[PDB]
Write a protein that binds this ligand. Structure first.
Ligand SMILES: [Cl-]
Length: 254
């Protein structure tokens, strides 16, 4: 079964989805601040963290499992890979999604024609590297997410601690997750979501290039965006106050 946790007692439900190679413990730093304003629903994505017994899955397969024991109605907030899951949830069960929020996430992580992103050969390299250098490879992908910030060292340690505090997922699971990043492109599909859609980014993010923000402001006219100036790929860790404020403003606007 998929591991779900409820935290807090706020009058708006908020689902929080973590990124690749991690688990819901990444949200520990913002729980207290958010818990009076939201009831939080924290999930370990299938195959990750405490959600054992799953193998490689496509985004479609993964989201359908996450949906099973998710709350009836909530804001859905996804970080990085979690942002793809939240997006797919908005596309499949719009009546269950009060608002879609992505944080440091792209609808298409891989660079393509006219589209900034990660070279797909780089993601393929990480996949290949998992076979013989499993632990360091996971850590090397995570190490990219905190660079250039005021709190880079501390924040990289935070993510590494999250990884090390639980058993490692199966290589199959991790390889499959990179395949989702490498192959999924939700740019066209997301034009059609009609609930509030807020996209948060870190200016210094080395995985999700800030150049995509104006491209998507134009491609997705119903959506809105905010760039945190001094944050990289984990803005809720480096800048929890600004992150929480964005969610307050969203909550009031529903
Ligand atoms: Cl990710």
């Amino acid at each position: 079964d998929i591991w779900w946790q409820t935290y807090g007692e706020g009058n708006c439900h908020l689902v929080l989805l973590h990124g690749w190679g991690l688990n819901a413990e990444v949200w520990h730093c913002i729980r207290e601040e958010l818990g009076s304003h939201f009831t939080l629903h924290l999930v370990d994505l299938p195959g990750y963290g405490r959600s054992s017994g799953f193998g490689a899955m496509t985004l479609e397969e993964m989201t359908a499992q996450v949906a099973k024991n998710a709350p009836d109605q909530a804001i859905w907030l996804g970080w990085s890979l979690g942002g793809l899951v939240a997006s797919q949830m908005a596309l499949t069960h719009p009546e269950r999604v009060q608002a879609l929020v992505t944080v440091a996430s792209s609808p298409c992580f891989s660079a393509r024609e006219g589209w900034p992103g990660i070279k797909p050969e780089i993601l393929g390299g990480f996949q290949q590297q998992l076979s013989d250098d499993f632990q360091r490879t996971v850590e090397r992908f995570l190490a990219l997410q905190t660079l250039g910030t005021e709190t880079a060292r501390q924040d990289a340690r935070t993510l590494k601690s999250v990884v090390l505090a639980q058993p490692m997922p199966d290589v199959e699971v991790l390889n499959g997750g990179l395949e989702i990043l490498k192959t999924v492109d939700l740019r066209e599909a997301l034009k059609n979501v009609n609930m509030p859609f807020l996209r948060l980014y870190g200016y210094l993010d080395g995985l999700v290039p800030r150049k995509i923000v104006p491209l998507l402001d134009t491609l997705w006219p119903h959506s809105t965006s905010q760039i945190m100036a001094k944050a990289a790929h984990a803005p809720f860790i480096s800048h929890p106050a600004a992150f929480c404020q964005a969610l307050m403003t969203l909550k009031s606007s529903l």
